[PDB]
Design a protein around this motif. Structure first.
Motif: not given
Length: 90
Positions: A14-20, A42-47, A60-68, A79-82
């Motif tokens: 999801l390239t930025g800016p999205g928005p997300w 109609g969002s990028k997430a839906a595209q 972004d290459g960071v597991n979530t199982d560890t992230m809340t 995230a910024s660029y992408n």
């Protein structure tokens, strides 16, 4: 024991800016798998490949199982660029 089944692990760019226009579900702080809560029509997430229910593994290459739930979310902002998000086929 130790063994997890998979179906198809993919990622979304999801390239930025999205928005997300997509929210996160459950999380580590919730003892649940970070899934795509909702998505804006109609969002990028839906595209891309992002779909409601998806199973997020890394953001972004960071597991979530560890992230809340928050952490993961905070990552979205980070995230910024992408905005990369690794999902998994339940």
């Amino acid at each position: 024991g130790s063994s997890g089944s998979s179906g198809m692990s993919y990622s979304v760019t999801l390239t930025g800016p999205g928005p997300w226009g997509f929210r996160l579900q459950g999380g580590k702080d919730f003892n649940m798998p970070l899934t795509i809560s909702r998505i804006t029509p109609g969002s990028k997430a839906a595209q891309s490949q992002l779909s409601q229910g998806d199973l997020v593994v890394a953001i972004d290459g960071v597991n979530t199982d560890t992230m809340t739930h928050l952490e993961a979310q905070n990552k979205i902002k980070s995230a910024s660029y992408n905005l990369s998000l690794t999902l998994q086929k339940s």
